Amino acid sequence: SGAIYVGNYRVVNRHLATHNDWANLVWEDSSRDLLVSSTTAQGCDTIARCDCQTGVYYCSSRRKHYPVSFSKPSLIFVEASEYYPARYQSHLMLAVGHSEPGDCGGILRCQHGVVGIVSTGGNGLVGFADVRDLLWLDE
Ligand SMILES: COc1ccc(Cl)cc1OC(=O)N1CCC[C@H](C(N)=O)C1
Numbered sequence: 182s183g184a185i186y187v188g189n190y191r192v193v194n195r196h197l198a199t200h201n202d203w204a205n206l207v208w209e210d211s212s213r214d215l216l217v218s219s220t221t222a223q224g225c226d227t228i229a230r231c232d233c234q235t236g237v238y239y240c241s242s243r244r245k246h247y248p249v250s251f252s253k254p255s256l257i258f259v260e261a262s263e264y265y266p267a268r269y270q271s272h273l274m275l276a277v278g279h280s281e282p283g284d285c286g287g288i289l290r291c292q293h294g295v296v297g298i299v300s301t302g303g304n305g306l307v308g309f310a311d312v313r314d315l316l317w318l319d320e
């Protein structure tokens with residue numbers, strides 16, 4: 182679990198969005214595993230606008246943060262799960278690091294701000310849904 186709170190927006194994994202997220206829907210994209218809902222309170226986070234390929238992520242299944250080197254956002258094949266059929270997920274960045282399904286939502290940050298959230302993983306890999314291209318999150 183986990184979310185980004187920026188301005189009057191809440192960014193979550195689409196597969197973990199709540200009834201309240203869908204009732205306050207701003208934008209969603211199944212191919213990216215992202216959903217953004219509106220909030221009444223002003224949010225705590227800053228979005229990075231950069232090309233960093235290193236950063237630190239939070240891993241809830243270890244209660245720890247880990248440094249990572251990750252690939253640029255790209256189209257990656259993701260196996261079927263209970264949430265989606267087998268498909269290509271876009272804007273996904275992969276790195277070597279521990280993750281389990283419940284780690285989805287953990288934030289990846291660089292020195293500039295929030296880069297994205299955990300969205301996929303397995304066998305010593307962790308994948309992050311990028312949010313740095315969503316320029317409207319800041320206006
Ligand atoms: C961090 O996620 C995992 C980590 C390890 C393992 Cl073995 C499996 C993990 O589950 C996943 O990769 N997915 C399940 C939920 C939906 C995801 C998606 N974005 O399509 C894919």
Ligand SMILES: [Zn+2]
Pocket residue numbers: 229230231232233291292293294
């Ligand atoms: Zn950066």
